[PDB]
Amino acid sequence: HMKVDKLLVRLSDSVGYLFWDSATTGYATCFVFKGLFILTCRHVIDSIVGDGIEPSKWATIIGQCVRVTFGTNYFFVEPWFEIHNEELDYAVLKLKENGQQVPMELYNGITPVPLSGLIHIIGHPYGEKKQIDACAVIPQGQRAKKCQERVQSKKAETQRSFQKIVHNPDVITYDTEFFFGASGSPVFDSKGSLVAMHAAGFAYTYQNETRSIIEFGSTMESILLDIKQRHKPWYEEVFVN
């Protein structure tokens, strides 16, 4: 369908390339969540700050070492780091206005989480050009079976490893090229409505190729509930008011 394809091209203007150069250098994907606030994965912030830094200083380091481009066209973020979560692997940052127009926010209400079918992901695999990809949902009930099949096929040449996606309705699973460094990329359902944020996969190297057993992202519903419970005053000023 092309009306959805034209919609996803429009939405892709809200998907950003996050770059950092701190003690290390790297990139990730992010997207405008609500207003000036962007979303990315929590493990990305951990890579920016690195290990052994007091929490009082993360906001200053983030403000000093992060830049975001949605295309001199870039945004800094505010030295502010308060809404985030390790298990759901999300982090909110706030863009600093600089006269350039902020792209439209992508959170557009309570999209149902697709239990099967097709989803779309927008982001920057390999830290290169922005891409829009279509992926098939892997239903929850087939996750454990899919993982063992593919591990055994390779060994032909356990499930304690995968037991963070097995009974987790808070994630969608799928197979995507966005495994290659596009963590933080927003995930859309077949209508082009924001449903999730791509998180990670299960990396391994086989015949000198880096591959992944399965990929997953945390649902917007689970992220928003966490924000609603843990940061109710912030939720009401940003989402309600």
Short mmCIF file of C-alpha atoms in Angstrom, two decimals:
data_model
loop_
_atom_site.label_atom_id
_atom_site.label_comp_id
_atom_site.label_asym_id
_atom_site.label_seq_id
_atom_site.Cartn_x
_atom_site.Cartn_y
_atom_site.Cartn_z
CA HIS A 1 0.00 0.00 0.00
CA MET A 2 1.28 3.45 -0.99
CA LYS A 3 -0.80 5.72 1.28
CA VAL A 4 0.93 4.02 4.21
CA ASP A 5 4.26 4.31 2.34
CA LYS A 6 3.74 8.04 1.83
CA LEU A 7 2.76 8.34 5.48
CA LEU A 8 5.94 6.55 6.65
CA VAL A 9 8.07 8.90 4.53
CA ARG A 10 6.39 11.81 6.25
CA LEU A 11 6.91 10.20 9.67
CA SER A 12 10.60 9.52 8.92
CA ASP A 13 11.27 13.28 9.20
CA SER A 14 10.81 12.77 12.95
CA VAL A 15 13.43 10.03 13.21
CA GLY A 16 16.83 11.29 14.20
CA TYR A 17 20.43 10.28 13.97
CA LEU A 18 21.96 10.55 17.47
CA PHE A 19 25.78 10.85 17.47
CA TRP A 20 28.16 11.11 20.41
CA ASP A 21 31.89 11.59 20.93
CA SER A 22 32.74 11.19 24.60
CA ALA A 23 35.26 8.79 26.08
CA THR A 24 33.94 6.73 23.15
CA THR A 25 32.28 7.58 19.82
CA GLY A 26 29.11 6.04 18.39
CA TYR A 27 25.67 6.55 16.96
CA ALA A 28 22.08 5.46 17.52
CA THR A 29 18.57 6.20 16.27
CA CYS A 30 16.07 8.38 18.18
CA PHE A 31 12.69 9.96 17.39
CA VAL A 32 10.49 12.84 18.53
CA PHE A 33 8.13 11.35 21.15
CA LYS A 34 6.07 14.30 22.41
CA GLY A 35 6.84 17.98 21.87
CA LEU A 36 10.57 18.66 22.36
CA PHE A 37 11.17 15.25 23.95
CA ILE A 38 12.89 12.48 22.05
CA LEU A 39 13.11 8.78 22.82
CA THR A 40 16.03 6.39 22.42
CA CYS A 41 17.23 3.26 24.20
CA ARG A 42 18.62 3.38 27.74
CA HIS A 43 21.66 1.29 26.73
CA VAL A 44 22.59 4.08 24.31
CA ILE A 45 22.90 6.54 27.20
CA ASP A 46 25.08 3.98 28.99
CA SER A 47 27.44 3.91 25.98
CA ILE A 48 27.59 7.72 25.91
CA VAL A 49 28.39 8.14 29.61
CA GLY A 50 30.42 4.94 30.06
CA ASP A 51 31.11 3.29 33.39
CA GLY A 52 32.07 4.83 36.73
CA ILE A 53 30.39 8.26 36.62
CA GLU A 54 28.29 9.69 39.45
CA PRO A 55 24.60 10.19 38.50
CA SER A 56 24.74 13.90 39.32
CA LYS A 57 26.99 14.34 36.26
CA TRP A 58 25.19 12.28 33.55
CA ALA A 59 22.94 15.16 32.53
CA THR A 60 25.91 17.47 32.08
CA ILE A 61 27.83 14.85 30.06
CA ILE A 62 24.80 14.09 27.87
CA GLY A 63 24.25 17.79 27.21
CA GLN A 64 27.95 18.13 26.30
CA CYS A 65 28.46 15.03 24.15
CA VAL A 66 25.21 14.33 22.24
CA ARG A 67 23.94 15.78 19.01
CA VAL A 68 20.84 14.85 17.00
CA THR A 69 20.20 15.36 13.27
CA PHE A 70 16.85 14.70 11.55
CA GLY A 71 18.14 15.57 8.06
CA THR A 72 24.47 23.16 9.85
CA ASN A 73 21.48 21.02 10.78
CA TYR A 74 21.70 19.54 14.29
CA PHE A 75 20.28 19.80 17.75
CA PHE A 76 21.89 19.57 21.11
CA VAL A 77 19.94 18.11 24.00
CA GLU A 78 19.31 19.72 27.34
CA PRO A 79 21.53 18.62 30.26
CA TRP A 80 18.54 16.78 31.70
CA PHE A 81 18.17 13.03 32.31
CA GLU A 82 15.29 11.89 34.58
CA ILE A 83 12.77 9.68 32.71
CA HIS A 84 14.34 6.33 31.79
CA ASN A 85 14.21 2.65 32.53
CA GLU A 86 16.66 -0.21 32.25
CA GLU A 87 14.31 -3.20 31.77
CA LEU A 88 12.10 -1.46 29.21
CA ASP A 89 15.34 0.04 27.81
CA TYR A 90 14.15 3.56 27.08
CA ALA A 91 15.43 7.03 27.85
CA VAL A 92 13.77 10.40 27.27
CA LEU A 93 15.94 13.39 26.34
CA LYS A 94 14.86 16.92 25.56
CA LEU A 95 16.00 18.74 22.42
CA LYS A 96 17.43 22.26 22.77
CA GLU A 97 15.68 24.70 20.42
CA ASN A 98 17.93 26.66 18.06
CA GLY A 99 15.58 28.29 15.54
CA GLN A 100 15.28 25.18 13.37
CA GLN A 101 11.83 23.63 13.26
CA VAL A 102 11.33 20.63 15.56
CA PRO A 103 9.78 17.68 13.66
CA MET A 104 6.27 16.51 14.47
CA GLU A 105 5.91 14.22 17.49
CA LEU A 106 5.21 10.54 16.70
CA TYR A 107 3.20 9.46 19.76
CA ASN A 108 -0.40 9.56 18.50
CA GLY A 109 -2.46 7.62 21.03
CA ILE A 110 -3.11 4.05 22.06
CA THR A 111 -2.06 1.97 19.06
CA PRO A 112 -2.94 -1.73 19.58
CA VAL A 113 0.14 -3.94 19.80
CA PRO A 114 0.12 -6.21 16.73
CA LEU A 115 0.16 -9.87 17.74
CA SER A 116 1.02 -10.94 14.17
CA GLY A 117 1.39 -9.49 10.70
CA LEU A 118 3.55 -6.68 9.32
CA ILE A 119 5.27 -3.80 11.09
CA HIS A 120 7.52 -1.02 9.79
CA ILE A 121 10.77 0.35 11.29
CA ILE A 122 12.40 3.70 10.47
CA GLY A 123 15.99 4.52 11.37
CA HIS A 124 19.66 4.49 10.49
CA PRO A 125 21.12 0.98 10.14
CA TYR A 126 24.96 0.97 10.05
CA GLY A 127 24.78 4.65 11.05
CA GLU A 128 24.25 5.42 7.40
CA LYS A 129 21.26 6.78 5.46
CA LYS A 130 17.77 6.71 6.91
CA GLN A 131 15.82 3.58 5.90
CA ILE A 132 12.17 2.45 6.12
CA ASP A 133 11.87 -1.35 6.35
CA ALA A 134 8.92 -3.79 6.51
CA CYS A 135 9.23 -6.77 8.90
CA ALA A 136 6.95 -9.65 9.86
CA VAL A 137 5.91 -9.90 13.50
CA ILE A 138 7.03 -13.09 15.24
CA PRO A 139 4.14 -13.91 17.67
CA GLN A 140 4.97 -14.47 21.36
CA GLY A 141 3.91 -18.12 21.31
CA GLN A 142 6.45 -18.93 18.58
CA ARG A 143 9.38 -17.03 20.14
CA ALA A 144 10.91 -19.90 22.14
CA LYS A 145 10.36 -22.35 19.27
CA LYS A 146 11.91 -19.97 16.72
CA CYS A 147 14.98 -19.40 18.90
CA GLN A 148 15.71 -23.10 19.45
CA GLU A 149 15.19 -23.95 15.76
CA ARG A 150 17.78 -21.41 14.64
CA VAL A 151 20.33 -22.24 17.37
CA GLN A 152 20.13 -25.96 16.50
CA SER A 153 20.37 -25.37 12.73
CA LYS A 154 23.69 -23.60 13.35
CA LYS A 155 24.97 -26.14 15.89
CA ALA A 156 24.07 -28.80 13.31
CA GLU A 157 27.01 -27.43 11.26
CA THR A 158 19.30 -23.54 25.58
CA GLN A 159 16.46 -21.17 26.48
CA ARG A 160 17.91 -19.47 29.58
CA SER A 161 19.55 -17.04 27.16
CA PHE A 162 16.29 -15.96 25.51
CA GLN A 163 14.21 -15.80 28.71
CA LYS A 164 13.84 -12.04 28.64
CA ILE A 165 11.57 -12.18 25.55
CA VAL A 166 9.70 -15.50 26.21
CA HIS A 167 6.81 -14.37 28.49
CA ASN A 168 7.24 -10.62 27.97
CA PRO A 169 4.11 -9.10 26.35
CA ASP A 170 6.00 -5.78 26.66
CA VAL A 171 7.98 -6.52 23.48
CA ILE A 172 7.30 -7.35 19.86
CA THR A 173 9.69 -9.74 18.17
CA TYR A 174 10.71 -9.77 14.50
CA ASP A 175 13.65 -10.23 12.10
CA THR A 176 15.22 -7.01 10.82
CA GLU A 177 18.36 -5.48 9.32
CA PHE A 178 17.92 -2.73 11.90
CA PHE A 179 19.74 -5.10 14.25
CA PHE A 180 22.89 -3.47 12.72
CA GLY A 181 23.12 -0.42 15.04
CA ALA A 182 19.60 1.04 14.62
CA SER A 183 18.58 0.64 18.27
CA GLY A 184 16.07 3.37 19.22
CA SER A 185 14.29 3.23 15.87
CA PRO A 186 10.50 3.68 16.15
CA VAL A 187 8.37 0.71 15.07
CA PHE A 188 4.95 1.21 13.40
CA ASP A 189 2.01 -1.13 12.82
CA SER A 190 0.64 -1.84 9.34
CA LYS A 191 -1.32 1.46 9.33
CA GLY A 192 1.79 3.51 10.07
CA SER A 193 0.89 4.12 13.72
CA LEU A 194 3.71 4.19 16.29
CA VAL A 195 3.65 1.00 18.37
CA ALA A 196 7.13 0.29 19.70
CA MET A 197 10.82 1.18 19.76
CA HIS A 198 13.42 -1.21 18.38
CA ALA A 199 15.77 -2.30 21.17
CA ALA A 200 18.23 -5.11 20.48
CA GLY A 201 18.81 -8.60 19.28
CA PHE A 202 20.93 -11.60 20.30
CA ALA A 203 24.28 -11.05 18.58
CA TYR A 204 26.64 -13.81 17.49
CA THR A 205 29.35 -14.21 14.85
CA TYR A 206 29.07 -17.03 12.34
CA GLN A 207 31.42 -17.50 9.39
CA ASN A 208 32.88 -14.10 10.32
CA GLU A 209 29.46 -12.46 9.87
CA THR A 210 27.73 -10.77 12.78
CA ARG A 211 24.16 -12.06 12.93
CA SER A 212 21.29 -12.12 15.40
CA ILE A 213 18.97 -14.92 16.51
CA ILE A 214 15.92 -12.66 16.91
CA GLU A 215 15.18 -8.95 17.37
CA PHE A 216 12.75 -7.17 19.67
CA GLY A 217 11.53 -3.76 20.77
CA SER A 218 9.58 -2.56 23.77
CA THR A 219 5.96 -1.43 23.18
CA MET A 220 4.93 2.21 23.56
CA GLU A 221 2.13 0.99 25.82
CA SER A 222 4.62 -0.46 28.31
CA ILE A 223 6.89 2.60 28.11
CA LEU A 224 4.01 5.02 28.67
CA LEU A 225 2.68 3.04 31.63
CA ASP A 226 6.12 3.22 33.24
CA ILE A 227 6.21 6.98 32.71
CA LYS A 228 2.64 7.27 34.04
CA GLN A 229 3.45 5.33 37.23
CA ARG A 230 6.96 6.64 37.96
CA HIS A 231 6.59 10.25 36.69
CA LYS A 232 2.91 11.26 36.94
CA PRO A 233 3.50 15.06 37.26
CA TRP A 234 5.70 15.03 34.17
CA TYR A 235 3.21 12.91 32.21
CA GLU A 236 0.38 15.33 32.96
CA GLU A 237 2.26 18.50 31.98
CA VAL A 238 3.65 16.98 28.79
CA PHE A 239 0.83 14.67 27.62
CA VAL A 240 -2.34 16.11 29.15
CA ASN A 241 -1.74 19.87 29.42
#
